[PDB]
Structures are given as C-alpha cells and as structure tokens.
From a paper:
The D593A and D593N unliganded enzymes and D593N complexes crystallized in the space group P21212, isomorphous, with wild-type TxGH116 crystals, whereas the crystals of TxGH116 D593A in complex with cellobiose and laminaribiose crystallized in the P212121 space group and had 2 molecules in one asymmetric unit. Comparison with the structure of the complex of D593A with cellobiose shows that in D593A the loop containing the catalytic acid/base, residues 585–596, is shifted and T591 does not interact with the nonreducing glucose residue while Y62 makes an addition interaction with the reducing end glucose residue. Nonetheless, the cellobiose is in a very similar position, suggesting no unusual effect on the substrate position is induced by hydrogen bonding to N593 in the D593N mutant. In each structure, the glucosyl residues at subsites –1 and +1 bind to the acid/base mutants in a relaxed 4C1 chair conformation.
Although no X-ray crystal structure of human GBA2 is available, structures have been solved for Thermoanaerobacterium xylanolyticumTxGH116 β-glucosidase, which shares 37% amino acid sequence identity with human GBA2.8 Instead of hydrolyzing glucosylceramide like GBA2, TxGH116 exhibits high activity toward 4-nitrophenyl β-D-glucopyranoside (4NPGlc), and β-1,3- and β-1,4-linked glucooligosaccharides. The TxGH116 structure contains an N-terminal domain, formed by a two-sheet β-sandwich, tightly associated with a C-terminal (α/α)6 solenoid domain that contains the catalytic nucleophile, E441, and general acid/base, D593, residues, which were verified by chemical rescue of alanine mutants. GH116 enzymes are retaining GHs, as shown for Saccharolobus solfataricus SSO1353 β-glucosidase/β-xylosidase, human GBA2, and TxGH116.6,8,12 In the retaining mechanism, catalysis involves two carboxylic acid/carboxylate side chains with one serving as an acid/base and the other as a nucleophile. Here, we report the structures of Thermoanaerobacterium xylanolyticum β-glucosidase (TxGH116) D593N acid/base mutant in complexes with cellobiose and laminaribiose and its catalytic mechanism.
Residue numbers in the entry: 31 to 428, 431 to 801
Write the structure that this text describes.
Amino acid sequence: DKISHKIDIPDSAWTIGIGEKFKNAGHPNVKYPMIDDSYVQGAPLGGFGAGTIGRTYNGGFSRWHLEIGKNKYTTVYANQFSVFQKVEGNKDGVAQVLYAGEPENGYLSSWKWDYPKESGMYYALYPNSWYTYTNKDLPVQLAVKQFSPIIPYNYKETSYPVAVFKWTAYNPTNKNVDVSIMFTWQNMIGFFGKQVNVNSGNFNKIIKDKSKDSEIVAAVMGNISNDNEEWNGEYSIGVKKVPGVDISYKAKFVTTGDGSDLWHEFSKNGILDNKDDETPTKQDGIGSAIAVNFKLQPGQTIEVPFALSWDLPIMKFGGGDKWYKMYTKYFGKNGKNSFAILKEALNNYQKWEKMIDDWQKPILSNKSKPDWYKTALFNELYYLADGGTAWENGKVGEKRTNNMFGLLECFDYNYYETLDVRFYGSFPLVMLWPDIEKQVMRQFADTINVQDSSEFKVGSNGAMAVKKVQGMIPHDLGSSYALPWIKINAYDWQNPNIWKDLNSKYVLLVYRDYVLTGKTDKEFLKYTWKSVKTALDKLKEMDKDNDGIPDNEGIPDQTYATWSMKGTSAYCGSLWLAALKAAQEIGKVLKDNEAYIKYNEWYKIAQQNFEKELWNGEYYNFDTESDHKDSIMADQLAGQWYADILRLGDILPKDHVQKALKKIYEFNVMKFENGKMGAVNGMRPDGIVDESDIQAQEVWTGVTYALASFMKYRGMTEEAYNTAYGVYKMTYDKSGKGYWFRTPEAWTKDGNYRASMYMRPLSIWSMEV
Ligand SMILES: OC[C@H]1O[C@@H](O[C@H]2[C@H](O)[C@@H](O)[C@H](O)O[C@@H]2CO)[C@H](O)[C@@H](O)[C@@H]1O
Ligand SMILES: [Ca+2]
C-alpha cells in the first residue's frame, strides 16, 4: 500500500476491505415487511433535493434515491470505473473492472469482473469517500477521492446533482507503465418513471469544451423527447484534461449486450474508438464511456478528475404533484443542463475540497475527541442527502418566495418531517443549514390552525377520528406516495391530534432555532408566535385533574405510543415545563407582557406538581398512573435536555437531574448488554428490562445520542461517550451489526433492527452544541 501515503485520508474515516464479506449483519425484528438492502452500502453522492446515488464499498452504483422519497436497491452493472495497465515493452496488458462482483444476468459478460479480495480498501468520512487499489497484478497503484460539495451555510452547491471523482495514480516500480482509467455510465433515462418502452428515444452525444485553461470531454446521455416529465432529462459523465494525459471516448455502447463492443477496444490498449454515434435506441439499453490514457515513469504521480452529473429537474409524488428541484434555480428547469453542471464541478472541485476541509477541520484537529466519535458524527450526516430529501423550486406549470423542504422520517415510515422525530434529528440543519431549518418550522407554523373535519380509520384499533384538529400540530407534512406539504398527517396508525408531546416539541423547536442561530432572529419569533401560544393553550385544555400539566390518557398519545403513559409523565411533563419556560422567554423578547405572566404562572404551578408527583429520591418516575410507573426511562428528562440547549436554566433541581442521569447510565446503559449497545428505553428498578411493550425493550439510536449530549452538558463526560460508544459500535464496528449508512431507529438485545435509514440518529450533532 504505497498509494495511501500519496493521498490524505483522515484517521477517523470508516474503513472496510473492497469485496469484504461481513458475517454478523442484523435483519428486521418485526413481522410486517421492512427494507433490508444488506450491508453492502456506501456514502451517498448528490446534493440536498437532487436525488442521491449510493455507491457501495464494492464499487457498485447500487442504492438509488433519484426518485425522491423512494429507495431502490439494484446495481446498474454498466456504471463502473475500469483500469487498463501495460508495463512498457510488454506485448499485452491487463484490464479490470473496479467492482468486487459480477452481473446476475448474462449482460456485459466480456468485461473482466470480480475485482479480487484483499486488494484494496474503501474509506468514508461524509461527504468524502475513497477507494484505494493495491493489487499484485496492477503495477501502478490507484486511489480515487469521490464527493459532492456538501457545505454548511451554503445553499447553492449543496443542492447540486453532481459527483467528482479525483483519481491519483502512482508508479512504485522501476519500469514505465501505460495506464488507462475509464468511466462507463448507462443512459438511465427511463430507469424510473416509464411504464413502457423504458429505453425508447434514449441517445448519447459527446461534448468537447476547449477553453484555453481547461479542456473537458463529456458524454451527455439524454432522450429525443422534450417532454417536461419526471423521467426526462440528462445524465453526464466526463473528465478534465491534465498535463501528460490524453482522452478517448465511446458515445454509444449497448448495455443490454455482451459488452465486447466496448471491451475489445479498452482491453487491447486502454484507448477507445472516439466514435460519436448519436442515433437513438428503441429497445436496447445504451451507455457512454470516457477514458484517459497516460504513461507513468518510475516514482511519478498524476492526478486526473472525472465527474458525474444528473439533470433530472422534476420530482413527482404519488398524488400527482410535480415540483422542480432546488438546483434548477442555478442551472435551469428544461432538463438539458447536465453538461453545465459537470463543467462547473470539473473547473471548481479544488475550491469545493478546501471548503469541505475548512468545515471538517475544527472537529478533526481536536485531539481530545476520539476518532470513533468523529466517524459517527460525520458519517451520520449521510441521511441529510439520502433521506428522500425534497427541496422545491416551484410547482410545475407556474414565481414564489420560499423553497419548501422535506426530510423523511425513513423509507419504511414514509412521512416528511415527522415532528416528534425531527425534535431529535434536526440538529444538523439548525447548526449547519439554519435557513432550511427555519423554513421547515414556518411550514409547521402555517399548519397549526388548519382544520380537516373529514375522518380517517385509525389503524391500531379501527376507530374513526378527525384528520386535523385546529390548534394541534401535525405528526408530519405528508408522504412521497401522496402530496408533501399539501396533504399533512399522512400517518394514520394512531391519532396525532390527541398527542401530548407534539405541541410542546414544536414550541421547543421554535425557540431552539432562535437560540442556536445567535438570538438575533426576532422576525422568526414574530412569524411563529401565534402558533406557539395557540399550541400551548390547546395543550393546557388536556389537563384533566387540574395539576397544571397535560394528562396522558393511557392510550396512544405520544412518541412512545404503544409503551403507554397515563397521568403526569416524566417525558411529556418535562417537555411541557420546558416549552412553558421557552414561551416565557419569547414573551419577554417580543414585549408580550401578558403572555409572559400567563406562561410563568402555568410554569411555576406545573413545576411544583411535577416534582411532587414524580421525584422518588433517585430518579423521576415514568408516570403517575401506569402499570409500569416506576420504570426508569432513558428519555425521562427530555424537557430539561432541551432547556440546557436553549439556555433556559434549571426546570428541575440540578441535584435531582444529576441523580436521574447517573441512574439511567447505571441501569439503562451499563445493565443492558454491558453498555455496549446504547441505552435501552425502559428498565425496572430491579435491573431487568421493562417488558410491558416492545418499545421499552428497544434501544433508540437517536434517543441515546441525545442522552449522551445531555450527560455531556451536565459534566458526565465519561458516561456520555460510553453511552454513545455503543451506538457507534453497533453501526460501524466489525463487532456490530453492519448498519453503516443505514442507521436504524431501533435495535433489540439481539442486535436486530427496526426501520433502517432513520432520521433520528442525526441527533448525534446535539453533542456538538
Ligand atoms: O419508532 C417511533 C416512531 O414510530 C412511528 O410509527 C411507526 C411505529 O413505530 C410502528 O410500530 C408502526 O408499525 O408503523 C408506524 C408508522 O406508520 C411514528 O411515525 C413516529 O412518530 C414515532 O416516533
Ligand atoms: Ca394533569
């Protein structure tokens, strides 16, 4: 491995061998159907709202999120990098596809498949990933750095449907070596969004752009149609010329054939025919090929950049709504702009690299933090781009001031911006992309007073209920199978209009966003104030016994729905206390003196009653009226956790909070599988897991990272990192269950999971407040 010294892979990068098998991978622990795409994953490529492409550690372009809100796992085998090498003075060379595997069907059989094991590594520190190629039969060693320009406080490049592949090649041998690197890409127009004739009209063309300081050669893969539809647009691949390399290309080869039309050229001398065949296809799959060839003298290094772009301007949801994607603001909406995007990337990727280094460096250079934590902190951010992200730039067939945004809860539970989940999972947005965060919360503000009197069938019991109640915050802002932003509350399994935590979390989220963006944005507080007051006032009406706190009703009425709460609960109670104190402070800032006085009286009354009803001398009871009331909940003081973040001070006595957290650490962590798997949600005071409901027996990844941050703020440094460590281990480590780049909501004692690719674990960013 002489190539690793010649590139800058950080030590915290997640690593695995190319072609490595993994023996202990977990699977779903529920009886209903649930996604399991295996452990062959990688860091995604593509910006926010662009649609993402998951290239795996084996090198395949396999996890497709280009259809916004859908997860499609299938390797498009034609999409590859391939290498040709010949030692100078030798008659023949070798050619090899850089993919640890082979096609299932008989297509592309003439290509050299099955990149051997123990011959290279994959590395990932999102948004960067790397492949190294160190193979006995390849004299020249190769590495590629691949990324998309995901940059905090940048809402432009961060949106781009683009990837850069910066190759580095080094000759450690005593002889000159001829080397070719080739990028193949299938014309994927019609891969989604066409019932019939999936390839028909597809055509490829070569573009050459020589502009003194920059020669670029690119294949543009489009369609003859000018239909402005979900499926139509362009993919492009290309390369920038550098000193000492020459470029060759093949505009059209058949992907639904044996491949020899391309391979017989490339495997001969690593040089292609430069044939520019623009004729459309009818039934055959087609693709393009871009290759560079060069000669490396002994000890010589060369760097050559490739790029990939996809101009697919329109997203369509299942309800029929068609929206333009965010990036269209910068490149246009007509779907004929893939080359412009690619050219931007090939001429600016070095700037983008430095911008990425600039925002990672403060964390990476802090040597007081262990590398494992950085691996998790950065790689968890995969979900921002990969979570079915929707970022609109106008509805198809119409100007507008704001660009609505949606991140999914997950693909199995296909709901945009699920509020109770985003309470934990929105930390990276507020901290790194605050304008997006604020926009999402204004979307929620705008839903508060919406009334939908028509009824729906509640799935868990069968009872009918009102869709959307005035003054109650929605569970979500819709589904990709229906109408995001328009038809809210797509979730019907329970009735969110009776939930006791959503209104509180909403208020806490509003004030969080003000506090963590510098306490300067009064306009944001003004925009949201009516909704805040309404939300707390409607929740006050659910106080039955007149203790000043909303009553949980012993039925599904909060986040932990099936692990029911009754009476005053630690969870909803603490959130209520914190929300009231947050409302007080907004009151003071906006000079709404009556609101201030009101919420202050409500706060003091509820605070006293909370302490009296729930403090047992060691921790806070789960609730007042359940069968499982003395259970130790991991999330018992969620309100106080947010109050620390919001700099709202002590809603509960310091001494009591400290004891509760020590108890949670002693029990929920260290008495659950030796504290190597996170915090189990519920534990009985006898040191046995609360078995009243499945949820209680689950570790929730995002709850645990949140709990770690809470411990950290309260000076429990060792406990915080030990708690978080178990979540890292399960996700990323060889001893875990192989959930890298698909971190689930939950696992049980056995390490099997529920709901892979989940928003909540983004809560790890709360540890950086
Ligand atoms: O995991 C907590 C999370 O649950 C989500 O509801 C799931 C539920 O967990 C599952 O048991 C059921 O079969 O499916 C529903 C989705 O329809 C819920 O969306 C979240 O609010 C909650 O945080
Ligand atoms: Ca009450």
